[PDB]
Every structure is written in structure tokens, then in C-alpha cells.
Amino acid sequence: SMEQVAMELRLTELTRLLRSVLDQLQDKDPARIFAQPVSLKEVPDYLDHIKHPMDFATMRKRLEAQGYKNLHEFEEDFDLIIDNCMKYNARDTVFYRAAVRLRDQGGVVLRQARREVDSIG
Numbered sequence: 001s002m003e004q005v006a007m008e009l010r011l012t013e014l015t016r017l018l019r020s021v022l023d024q025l026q027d028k029d030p031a032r033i034f035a036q037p038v039s040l041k042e043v044p045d046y047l048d049h050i051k052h053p054m055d056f057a058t059m060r061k062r063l064e065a066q067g068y069k070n071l072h073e074f075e076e077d078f079d080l081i082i083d084n085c086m087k088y089n090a091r092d093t094v095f096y097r098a099a100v101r102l103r104d105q106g107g108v109v110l111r112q113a114r115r116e117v118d119s120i121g
């Protein structure tokens with residue numbers, strides 16, 4: 001049907017906006033601390049601590065599979081990256097600190113993306 005295509009055209013444009021959002025968020029992690037999943041070979045106990053791991057490459061594969069229905073789902077994944085890090089790592093570490101900064105710097109970008117999504121559809 002013609003409805004399904006118009007929907008697919010919107011999902012596609014939502015994917016195009018979320019791609020740009022993802023690039024802007026990832027630019028706020030120049031150290032690439034959140035680039036890739038936490039290594040289970042290197043932190044073998046990680047899953048005893050963190051039940052839902054997340055990272056920017058894993059978000060990217062979901063993004064390109066058009067697996068984000070809306071901005072809320074996308075934000076959930078971003079928040080996981082931050083919240084996981086802040087639990088596993090103590091306050092006085094470079095990792096915890098990198099998350100706090102990513103959160104603060106990401107808020108501006110997510111603020112405007114919420115307006116652009118409401119505004120465009």
C-alpha cells in the first residue's frame with residue numbers, strides 16, 4: 001500500500017535525523033570511551049554488574065537497521081551508555097567523569113532534537 005511507503009519515508013527521515021544526532025553525541029566523546037562495547041574478554045564479570053550493555057557502535061547497527069521507532073527509544077539507549085558507566089565505575093575515575101560530560105554536553109543536542117522531531121513529525 002501507499003500508506004506503508006509514506007510511513008517508510010518518515011521512518012527513513014527519522015533515521016536520517018537520528019544519524020546526525022548520533023554523530024553529534026559521539027563527537028562529545030573524543031576519547032572514544034563509549035565507542036565500542038565493554039570487552040567481556042577484558043572485563044569478564046561485566047554482565048554480573050550490567051544487565052543491558054550499550055555503546056555507540058551497537059546503537060549505530062540498530063540505527064542503520066531502522067530499529068529506532070521514535071526518539072524515546074534512541075534516548076533510552078544513550079542513557080544506558082551513561083548510566084551503566086556511572087554504576088560500574090567509581091566517581092573518581094576517568095570513565096565516570098567522561099560519562100558526566102557526555103551527559104551534560106548531550107543534553108543540548110537532545111533538547112533540540114526533541115523540538116525538530118515534534119516540529120517535522
Ligand code: NA
Pocket residue numbers: 086087088089090
Ligand atoms: Na558504582
